[PDB]
C-alpha cells in the first residue's frame, strides 16, 4: 500500500 | 585513504535495469549547465545555492539550484564569485525563490585565479578499457586549474556516447562501467556509470553523487573508464 499526500496550494499573492 | 576499487558485485548491471537507458543518456549527451563569474543570489535549504543562469541554448531556465553535501560547503561558496559546470535535471526539481528552473549537484569552483594565461585549455587524459584491455584513449579539455570531477566525467561520457554508444535509448552495449580518477598524490575514487536495478531511473538520486563537489588538479589528474560487455 502506498500512502498518498495532499498537495499544497499557492496562496494569493 | 583512497576509495577501494569496485569488484563485479559492487557494480550496477545494465541487464538488471529494465527502464529506458535514454533517461541516463539524456544526462550526458550534450547536456550541462555552464556559467562564469556568477554569484549566488538565493538558497532554498542550508546546503544549496541558487544562481541566475539562463539557458543559452533553448531558454528552458533562468534559475539553477545546486545542492551540496552539507551546509559548510554551501557557506563556503555562498559569497564567492564562482564558475559552474554540471549535469542538470528537471524531473522532481523543486524550489522557490523571489522563468524556468533547473536543478543540479556540486559543480562549483572559485573563479579567482583558477584559469590559465591567455585563456588556454588544459588537456586531461582518459583511457578506456573494455574487458580489461585499453581500447581507445583520448583527452577532454577544461579551462580550470582546479576542476570538478563532475565536469570531467560529463565530458568523458559525452564523448563516449557519440563514439561508442555508451548509452542508447533502450539499453547499453555494456553490462558494467565505472569511471576512475587518479590524482597526482595517489588518491583514487570512482563513480558507477550504470543505473540502479529496477524499471525506473531516478536522475536526481543518481546525480546526488556529485554533491561533494570534489575537485581535482586538471594538469595532473588521470582518468580511466572501465567497461565490460555481457560477453566479449
Amino acid at each position: 500500500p502506498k500512502w498518498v499526500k495532499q498537495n499544497t496550494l499557492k496562496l494569493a499573492t | 585513504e583512497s576509495q577501494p576499487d569496485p569488484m563485479p558485485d559492487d557494480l550496477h548491471k545494465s541487464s538488471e535495469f529494465t527502464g529506458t537507458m535514454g533517461n541516463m543518456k539524456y544526462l550526458y549527451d550534450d547536456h550541462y549547465v555552464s556559467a562564469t563569474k556568477v554569484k549566488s543570489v538565493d538558497s532554498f535549504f542550508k546546503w544549496d545555492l541558487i544562481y541566475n543562469i539562463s539557458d543559452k541554448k533553448l531558454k528552458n531556465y533562468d534559475k539553477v539550484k545546486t545542492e551540496l553535501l552539507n551546509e559548510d560547503l554551501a557557506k563556503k561558496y555562498k559569497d564567492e564569485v564562482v564558475d559552474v559546470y554540471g549535469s542538470n535535471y528537471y524531473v522532481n526539481c523543486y524550489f522557490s525563490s523571489k522563468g524556468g528552473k533547473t536543478c543540479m549537484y556540486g559543480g562549483i569552483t572559485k573563479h579567482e585565479g583558477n584559469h590559465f594565461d591567455n585563456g588556454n585549455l588544459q588537456n586531461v587524459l582518459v583511457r578506456v578499457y573494455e574487458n580489461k584491455r585499453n581500447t581507445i584513449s583520448f583527452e577532454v579539455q577544461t579551462d580550470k586549474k582546479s576542476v570538478t570531477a563532475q565536469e570531467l566525467d560529463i565530458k568523458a561520457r559525452n564523448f563516449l556516447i557519440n563514439k561508442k554508444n555508451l548509452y542508447e535509448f533502450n539499453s547499453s552495449p555494456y553490462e558494467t562501467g565505472y569511471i576512475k580518477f587518479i590524482e597526482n598524490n595517489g588518491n583514487t575514487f570512482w563513480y558507477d556509470m550504470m543505473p540502479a536495478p529496477g524499471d525506473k531511473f531516478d536522475q536526481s538520486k543518481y546525480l546526488m553523487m556529485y554533491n561533494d563537489n570534489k575537485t581535482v588538479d586538471s594538469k595532473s589528474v588521470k582518468i580511466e573508464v572501465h567497461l565490460t560487455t555481457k560477453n566479449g
Binding site: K2, W3, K5, T8 | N92
Partner: protein, 179 residues
C-alpha cells in the same frame, strides 16, 4: 472520535528548516529526509508494510516556503513569539539497578521548532546510542520532541537533559538520578 491521521509540514525562516511528516494518533509514522530525499519510517517494520513517494514531499515544501514569504509580507513582517518548552525526563519503564532501560527527554509545548538538546552523565556530554525524533505537531500548533538515551542504572551515575531554546533565558537542565 476514534482515530486521527495528520500530514504535517512546515517551513521556517530565516533558519530555512523544513519538515514533512505523517502522524497517527500522536505517533510519527514517517518523515521525509529533505537532504537525502527519502522516507524515514519511525519503526523499521513500517517500511515493509507500506511505502511513500518522498520526492513528493519536496514539491509541497517548495510551495510552503513560497507561501511563508507571502504571509510574512502580508503580516508586515510580524515575527513569531518564542514559547519555551516544558521539559520532562523519564524512563520508559520502572528502573531497576543494572537492568537496561531508556531515559526519555520529553520537550513539549514550544515554538519555533528549533531546539538544542544535550545529554549529560555526571556533568559530561554523552553521544553514545542517543537518538531523537523530528518535531511533532500539537493541536495548539506548538511542537513536541523526544530525545532518547539508553542506559544502565546505578546509584553511581546522575543525568541531565540540557535544553536550549530562544524562549529560554538560560539553558534548562532536567536532572535525573536513581531514586
Amino acid at each position: 472520535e476514534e482515530h486521527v491521521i495528520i500530514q504535517a509540514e512546515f517551513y521556517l525562516n530565516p533558519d530555512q528548516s523544513g519538515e514533512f511528516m505523517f502522524d497517527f494518533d500522536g505517533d510519527e509514522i514517517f518523515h521525509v529526509d529533505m537532504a537525502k530525499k527519502e522516507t524515514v519510517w519511525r519503526l523499521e517494520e513500517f517500511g515493509r508494510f507500506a511505502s511513500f513517494e518522498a520526492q513528493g514531499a519536496l514539491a509541497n515544501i517548495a510551495v510552503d516556503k513560497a507561501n511563508l514569504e507571502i504571509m510574512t509580507k502580508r503580516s508586515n513582517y510580524t515575527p513569531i513569539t518564542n514559547v519555551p518548552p516544558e521539559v520532562t525526563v523519564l524512563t520508559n519503564s520502572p528502573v531497576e539497578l543494572r537492568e537496561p532501560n531508556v531515559l526519555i527527554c520529553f520537550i513539549d509545548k514550544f515554538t519555533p521548532p528549533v531546539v538544542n538538546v544535550t545529554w549529560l552523565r555526571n556533568g559530561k556530554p554523552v553521544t553514545t546510542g542517543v537518538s531523537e525524533t523530528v518535531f511533532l505537531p500539537r493541536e495548539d500548533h506548538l511542537f513536541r520532541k523526544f530525545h532518547y538515551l539508553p542506559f544502565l542504572p546505578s546509584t553511581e551515575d546522575v543525568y541531565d537533559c540540557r535544553v536550549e531554546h530562544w524562549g529560554l533565558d538560560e539553558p534548562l537542565l532536567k536532572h535525573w538520578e536513581f531514586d
